[PDB]
C-alpha cells in the first residue's frame, strides 16, 4: 500500500493550484458549498449561475511577513470586488450568494521557524479603537484586495488593530473554534479552507455585507537562520465556488 | 454507554497520540490511547448542557422607574417619569449577553415576565393599589407621547394590565425577519460613507411603553418595573470565540481603552505550580 | 397536555438527543483515522 | 366550579420553571427555518474542540507571546513548564474549555492536553509530559514526575503530541472553583534528552499548548460566570 | 401476619433463651420462647417508621432578618441588614440535626419552603407590599456584595421572587458530588498539619442570598425570613449510635466542657422501682 | 378558563403535606447510586438490636460503671436490681430502644431483655428474672416476684440469658411518656440460689444488661424528643 | 379540593388571549344567519383588488 | 398524575415494604439457629 | 373542552381556510382568461 498525502491539486475553471507540502484541506462544518434550493428560496427572480467564468482562483497581492508583523485580515466578498467578471457581477446584481475555496501560501526553507493561524470568522464584526458607541466607517471595513494590516496604527472612524483581542474583544487562543488551519513552516507551506454560504437568509446584498472574514495571524514569530533576510512572502488565493446572483439592476454605487 | 474501555499493553506501529494539529482537526484521542484503562460507564446523558437548557432560564433584561403624579406644569411626561420606553434588545445585561452572543445565529420563542414593585420615598399613609400597563409598540406603530395619549387605547397593539406587587407573563413567537436572529452583523444599513455599522433593523424587535393606568393621587409612588426574558424552543448556529473584555454599548462589539489584562499572570516563572 | 392554541405557548422540547461533535472537531476533506499517519 | 386549595408558594417568581403561557401575538406564523451550517445541540460538542492555553502567562500585559512555551537549546534534565490543574482558574480560565467550565459547578471526566512543535525542520527534541495525580507534591525533578502518568514525545514528522489526562478521582465529581479536597493534580513538561538546533540557527523555539474534553466529560449545576461584570446598565 | 404464635408447654434439650451475646448477634427470641402464648396478629404495617417518613416532614433550618432602608451613608450592606447570606447546611437546628445525623450516609431530594414575615418596630402608617428575592449561589458563583449588585441579575443562577407574608416552594435534586451525603467524615481537606477536620467541601451545598427587591421607603420594615426543608425519596446507610450531649458548632462533633450528666440518676439504690 | 372555588385553608403552611413542586435545577442529572453496605429501610429494623441499659444509674456523674449491675457473693434470697418499665424514661431513656421510642407517642408489642455474666469461668450463680405486670405492687421478696412472669437462669457455658417481656395490656397501645394508666409494670432480679466464687478470688462480679424490640413491636404518632435542646442557633 | 399552585402572571389583563367566559344572556337564541353577497374571510382577498395610486401628489 | 418533568418534583415513594433486620441483628459468619448451642 | 353551555362562551373558530378572491377581483358576467384578448 504505497502512496503520499502531501501532494494535492485543485482545478477551478482555467486555473490549477498544485502543492507538495500540504496539510489536509478543511471544509467548514463538514458541508461542501451548494446552490440555493427551491425549498429555501425567497426572491422569485431566477438566479444567474456564471459557472467557469467566475468560479476560478484569483491571487491577492502578497504580504511580507516580518519578525514584527502582527497579522492580516481580509473581508469577503469585498476582497474580490475588482477581480474580473466576479467583481463586475457582484456590483451589477442587487443580491448574491457564494461559497469560496481559500488557499494561503507561505513557502520557506528547512531552517526557518514560525507558525500562522489561518482562520475564517463568519460576521467578524469589528470594534472601533475609540471605544464607547463609535461605529467603524464603511471605507475601513471594505478595503478590497489590499486587506487590513494589523501591524499599522489606528485611524479615526476605523477599527481597532489589537490582534490579541481579535479586533472585537475575544482572545486569539480561542479562534480555534472557527474553521482554521495552521501553516507551520516546519510541516507545511499551504493552508486550505472550503467555505459554504453562511448567512441567516438564503441570498443577500454583496455590497453592504461581508459574510466571512479571513484572518492570517502569526502565532510563533518568524525566526530566520543567521544571515537570511528577516522577511517571508505570503500569497492568498481565493476562488468563488457554487456562486449564485439575483436581481440584475444598474451598477451599484459604493463609497470612495 | 461505555466511557472508558478495558485496555491492556500496547506494542504497535500505529501511534494514536502523534498527529498534526496543523490540519485543523482535533483527533478524538481517548484515555485508553495513552495509558491502560478499565471498563467504566458514562451513567450521564448531558441534559443540563443542551443549548435549550444553557439559554432556557430567566434573566432580567430591563429595569425602569415610573411615577403616579399630576401632569399639570410638565412639558415632557417621559422626563417626568410618568411613562417610560424600552427599545427591545437582550444586550443591556452582560450575564445574559455573553451566553447568547456565544453563537452567531439563534432562533428562539421568547417568554417575557414583568415584575413591578412599589416604593414611597416621600410621605404616604397607605399602600396604593396601582395598575401598570405594558404596551408593545412594533416598528411603525405610534410610540406613546403622553401618559394619557390616544395611543394607549391599543385597538390593535398587544397590551397587558396587572397590579403592582404582582407579575404578568406572556409568550412571544420568533419575530425576526430572517430565519434566525443575527447576534453579529459585519455590514451596514445602506452603501454609505457615514451609515451605522452592525446596529441596524436586523436587531430591531420594536419598543415597549410602560405607564401607570391608575389616575394620579396626592402621594408620589415610584414603581420599579423589571422585565425578565426566558427562551423556549432554542436553536443555535455557528459557535463563536467567547467574549473576554467588558462591553461599552448595546449591539456593538466595542471595548474600553486602557482596559485591564484578561490573562491572570502567574506568581513566579512558567515552571511554578 | 397543551392548554393553548399556539406552538409559542408550549414548554421546552427537552434535549436534542442525537449529538455529533465531528462537524466541529474534524471538519477535514479527507477522513483521518487515529493511529494511521495524519500526513504521509 | 371545582373546589381547589392553593399550596404554599403560589404566585412566587422562580426563574427556572418551564410552564406554558399565553401568546401576545395570536395566530402568528414565524419565518421558515433554513439550512445554516454549524448547528449546535449541546455544549459537550464544542467543548471537545482544542483551544490554545496561555501557558506563558508570565508577562506584564496580555500578548501573543503568552501562548508560546519557550524551549532553550542545550538544556539537560530541566523543566519546560509546570501548572496546577484547576480548570476553572489560572491558565485555563481564558480558554474555551475553562471558560465553558466556569458556567457550571461540577465537572468530571478526562481532559485532552496537546502540544505542537514549531522549531526548524532539521531540529530535534525529546520531551516528557508528566501528569501527577492529587495527594502528591508538585514534582521538582524529571525522576519525580516520571514516577507518575507520562508520555515521552519524540519530535519528528508528526508535529503534535496528544496526552490524555485520565480521570483519577475517588469522588465522582470535582468542583470547577479551586477547592483543595477536589484538586485535580499537576502538569509538568521536562527535557527527556535535550533540544538540538541545526547549524547557522539561533535562539529559543516554541511549543503551542491546547486543551479539549474527551467524549466522557460531564458538567452540571449551572451558574453565572465571574469572568465578566458591570456596574451600570448598557445603552445603545 | 401473626405477631405471637399459639404455644403450649415446653420440655426440650434445645433452650432458645440461653445464648452468647459475645458473638455480636442479638438472637430473634420471641415471647413464645419464654412463656406459653396465644395466636394474635400484627394488624400493623409500620409505615410511620419508614426512613422516608422519619426524615420526610418539614423543619426550619435558618432564620434571618432583612431591612428596606436607604443605602446612603453605609459601607457594608450585609452589616446594615439590607441583604443576608446563608451557607447552606442542615446542622443549625438540633431537632433536625439529631434525626439526620443518626445515619452515616443519606441520599435525598430536597424541598425548600421559604416563609417571609414583616414587622414595623418603628413608626409606619400602612403594611408595605414588599417583594423578597431568594438567590441560590452555588460554589464558584459570585456571592452578592451590595443590595443592588450586578450579581442579582441572575442570568444563570436559580432565583425566586415572592410577596412578604406569603410563601415560596421549590424542589432541589440530590446535589452531592458523591453517591450519598456524608453526615460524618473522619478525614481532612489535604495532607496538612493545620487543615480543617470534618468540615470540608464534602458538606458544601453552596450559599443563599436574600434581599428585598423593592426600593427603599420612608419607614423601616424588618422582615424575618424562615427557611424550611422537607426531604423526598430518602435513602440512608450505616445506622449510628444516637447523639446524647448538646452541640457547639455546625459540621463538627464537639460538645461543651463541664457538661451535665446525661444518665438520669435514680432516687434510691439499684433495687428501687 | 375552568371556573373553580377555593376551599378554606388555601395558602396555609402545613409541615406534613407531601405534594409535587417545581425544580430549581431543571434537567439536572444526579450522581449515580452506589452499593453501600448497611442500608436501613425502616426503624423497626435497628430498634430490634440490643443496646446496654445503664441499670446501675446510682452514681453522681456518668461513668462506664453505670452499665455494670453488681453481684455480691454469699447473698441468699435478696434482690440484684429493680426498675419500673417506662421505656421512654429512667434507665431506658439513653438506650437506643428508649431513645428511638422517644420520637413516637404510642408503643405496643413485646420487649427483649437480656443479661450477660462476666464472673470467673470457675464461678457459679443461679438468678431469677421476674416481670410483674401492671396493677400489682413492685415486688418486695423473691416469693412475691416469682408469683409473676419469671425465668430461672443457671449461669454456665451459655453466658447470656434472654427473657422476653410478653405484651400484657388491655388497651392496644401504651404511651411512651410516663402515664400511670398506661404503665408497663416492673422488672426485678433475685438470687435463686446464691453466687459462689472459686478459691483465691475476691470482691463483686458484674452483669451487663441489654434491651431490644421483638418483631411484633409497633410505634406511631411521631414527635420531637426532649433529650436534646438549644437556646441559640448554631454557627460554623 | 384539588391542591393547585398559581403561576406568575395570574389576574393580569392581556388584550390578545382567547379563553372562554360566562354569558351575560344565558339561553339566548341569536337572529338566524342570512345569505348576504360579498362575504370576506381574510384580508388577502381584498388587498388583491386594484386601487388608484395618487401618483401626481404634487398639488 | 405527575405535573412536572423532573423526578425531583415528585411526592414520596411511600414505604420500602420488604424489610430484613438480620443484616444488623445477626451479622455473623456462621448462621446460628435459636435453641441449638451458640458455642460447642 | 368547553366549560360553559352557550356557543357565545366559546373561543374563536380559528380561520376560514377555503379562500377565493375572484368574487371581488373579477366579478364579471363573461369569464376572462389571462393572455386571451379582454375585448375583441
Swiss-Prot record, chains C, H, I:
It comes from Human rhinovirus 14. Transmembrane segments: none annotated. It is found in: Virion. This is Capsid protein VP4. Lies on the inner surface of the capsid shell. After binding to the host receptor, the capsid undergoes conformational changes. Capsid protein VP4 is released, Capsid protein VP1 N-terminus is externalized, and together, they shape a pore in the host membrane through which the viral genome is translocated into the host cell cytoplasm. Interacts with capsid protein VP1 and capsid protein VP3. Myristoylation is required during RNA encapsidation and formation of the mature virus particle.
Swiss-Prot record, chains D, F:
It comes from the Viruses. It is found in: Virion; Host cytoplasm. Interacts with capsid protein VP0 and capsid protein VP1 to form heterotrimeric protomers. Five protomers subsequently associate to form pentamers which serve as building blocks for the capsid. Interacts with capsid protein VP4 in the mature capsid. Interacts with protein 2C; this interaction may be important for virion morphogenesis. Forms an icosahedral capsid of pseudo T=3 symmetry with capsid proteins VP2 and VP3. The capsid is 300 Angstroms in diameter, composed of 60 copies of each capsid protein and enclosing the viral positive strand RNA genome. This is Capsid protein VP3. It comes from Human rhinovirus 14 (HRV-14). The chain holds residues 332 to 567 of 2179 of the full protein.
Amino acid at each position: 500500500c504505497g502512496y503520499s498525502d502531501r501532494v494535492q491539486q485543485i482545478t477551478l475553471g482555467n486555473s490549477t493550484i498544485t502543492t507538495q507540502e500540504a496539510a489536509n484541506a478543511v471544509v467548514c462544518y463538514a458541508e461542501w458549498p451548494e446552490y440555493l434550493p427551491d425549498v429555501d428560496a425567497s426572491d422569485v427572480n431566477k438566479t444567474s449561475k456564471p459557472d467557469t467564468s467566475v468560479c476560478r482562483f484569483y491571487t491577492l497581492d502578497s504580504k511580507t511577513w516580518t519578525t514584527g508583523s502582527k497579522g492580516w485580515c481580509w473581508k469577503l466578498p469585498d476582497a474580490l470586488k475588482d477581480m474580473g467578471v466576479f467583481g463586475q457581477n457582484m456590483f451589477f446584481h442587487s443580491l448574491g450568494r457564494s461559497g469560496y475555496t481559500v488557499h494561503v501560501q507561505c513557502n520557506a526553507t528547512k531552517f526557518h521557524s514560525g507558525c500562522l493561524l489561518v482562520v475564517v470568522i463568519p460576521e467578524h464584526q469589528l470594534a472601533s479603537h475609540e471605544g464607547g458607541n463609535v461605529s467603524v466607517k464603511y471605507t475601513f471595513t471594505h478595503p478590497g484586495e489590499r486587506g487590513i494590516d494589523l501591524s499599522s496604527a489606528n485611524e479615526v472612524g476605523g477599527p481597532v488593530k489589537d490582534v490579541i483581542y481579535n479586533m472585537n474583544g475575544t482572545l486569539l487562543g480561542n479562534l480555534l473554534i472557527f474553521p482554521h488551519q495552521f501553516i507551520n513552516l516546519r510541516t507545511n507551506n499551504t493552508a486550505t479552507i472550503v467555505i459554504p454560504y453562511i448567512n441567516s437568509v438564503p441570498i443577500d446584498s454583496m455590497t453592504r455585507h461581508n459574510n466571512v472574514s479571513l484572518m492570517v495571524i502569526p502565532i510563533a514569530p518568524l525566526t530566520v537562520p543567521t544571515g537570511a533576510t528577516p522577511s517571508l512572502p505570503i500569497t492568498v488565493t481565493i476562488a468563488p465556488m457554487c456562486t449564485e446572483f439575483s436581481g440584475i439592476r444598474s451598477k451599484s454605487i459604493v463609497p470612495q | 454507554t461505555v466511557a472508558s474501555i478495558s485496555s491492556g499493553p500496547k506494542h504497535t506501529q500505529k501511534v494514536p497520540i502523534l498527529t498534526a494539529n496543523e490540519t485543523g482537526a482535533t483527533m478524538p484521542v481517548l484515555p485508553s490511547d495513552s495509558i491502560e484503562t478499565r471498563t467504566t460507564y458514562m451513567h450521564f446523558n448531558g441534559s443540563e448542557t443542551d443549548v435549550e437548557c444553557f439559554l432556557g432560564r430567566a434573566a432580567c433584561v430591563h429595569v425602569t422607574e415610573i411615577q403616579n403624579k399630576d401632569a399639570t406644569g410638565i412639558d415632557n411626561h417621559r422626563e417626568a417619569k410618568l411613562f417610560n420606553d424600552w427599545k427591545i434588545n437582550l444586550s443591556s445585561l452582560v450575564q445574559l449577553r455573553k451566553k447568547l452572543e456565544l453563537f452567531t445565529y439563534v432562533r428562539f420563542d421568547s417568554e417575557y415576565t414583568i415584575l413591578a414593585t412599589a416604593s414611597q420615598p416621600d410621605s404616604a399613609n397607605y399602600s396604593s393599589n396601582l395598575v401598570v400597563q405594558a404596551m408593545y409598540v412594533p416598528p411603525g406603530a405610534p410610540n406613546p407621547k403622553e401618559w394619557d395619549d390616544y395611543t394607549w387605547q391599543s385597538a390593535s397593539n398587544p397590551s397587558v394590565f396587572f397590579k403592582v406587587g404582582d407579575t404578568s407573563r406572556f409568550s412571544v413567537p420568533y419575530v425576526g425577519l430572517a430565519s434566525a436572529y443575527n447576534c453579529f452583523y459585519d455590514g451596514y444599513s445602506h452603501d454609505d460613507a457615514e451609515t451605522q455599522y452592525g446596529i441596524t433593523v436586523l436587531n430591531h424587535m420594536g419598543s415597549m411603553a410602560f405607564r401607570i393606568v391608575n389616575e394620579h393621587d396626592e402621594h408620589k409612588t415610584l414603581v420599579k418595573i423589571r422585565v425578565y426574558h426566558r427562551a423556549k424552543h432554542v436553536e443555535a448556529w455557528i459557535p463563536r470565540a467567547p467574549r473576554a473584555l467588558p462591553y461599552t454599548s448595546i449591539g456593538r462589539t466595542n471595548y474600553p481603552k486602557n482596559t485591564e489584562p484578561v490573562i491572570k499572570k502567574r506568581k513566579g516563572d512558567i515552571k511554578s505550580y | 397536555i397543551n392548554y393553548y392554541k399556539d406552538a409559542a405557548s408550549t414548554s421546552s422540547a427537552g434535549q436534542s438527543l442525537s449529538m455529533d461533535p465531528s462537524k466541529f472537531t474534524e471538519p477535514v476533506k479527507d477522513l483521518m483515522l487515529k493511529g494511521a499517519p495524519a500526513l504521509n | 366550579g371545582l373546589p381547589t386549595t392553593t399550596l404554599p408558594g403560589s404566585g412566587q417568581f422562580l426563574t427556572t420553571d418551564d410552564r406554558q403561557s399565553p401568546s401576545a401575538l395570536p395566530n402568528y406564523e414565524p419565518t421558515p427555518r433554513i439550512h445554516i451550517p454549524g448547528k449546535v445541540h449541546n455544549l459537550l460538542e464544542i467543548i471537545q474542540v482544542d483551544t490554545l492555553i496561555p501557558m506563558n502567562n508570565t508577562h506584564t500585559k496580555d500578548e501573543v507571546n503568552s501562548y508560546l512555551i519557550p524551549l532553550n537549546a542545550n538544556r539537560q534534565n530541566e523543566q519546560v513548564f509546570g501548572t496546577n490543574l484547576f480548570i476553572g482558574d489560572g491558565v485555563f480560565k481564558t480558554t474555551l474549555l475553562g471558560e465553558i467550565v466556569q458556567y457550571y459547578t461540577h465537572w468530571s471526566g478526562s481532559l485532552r492536553f496537546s502540544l505542537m512543535y514549531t522549531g526548524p525542520a532539521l531540529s530535534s527534541a525529546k520531551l516528557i509530559l508528566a501528569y501527577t495525580p492529587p495527594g502528591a507534591r508538585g514534582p521538582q525533578d524529571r525522576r519525580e514526575a516520571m514516577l507518575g502518568t507520562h508520555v515521552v514525545w519524540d519530535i519528528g514528522l508528526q508535529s503534535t503530541i496528544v496526552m490524555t489526562i485520565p480521570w483519577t478521582s475517588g469522588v465522582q465529581f470535582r468542583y470547577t472553583d479551586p477547592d483543595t479536597y477536589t484538586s485535580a493534580g499537576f502538569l509538568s513538561c521536562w527535557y527527556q534528552t535535550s533540544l538540538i538546533l541545526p547549524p547557522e540557527t539561533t535562539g529559543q523555539v516554541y511549543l503551542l499548548s491546547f486543551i479539549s474534553a474527551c467524549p466522557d466529560f460531564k458538567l452540571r449545576l449551572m451558574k453565572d460566570t465571574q469572568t465578566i461584570s458591570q456596574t451600570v446598565a448598557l445603552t445603545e
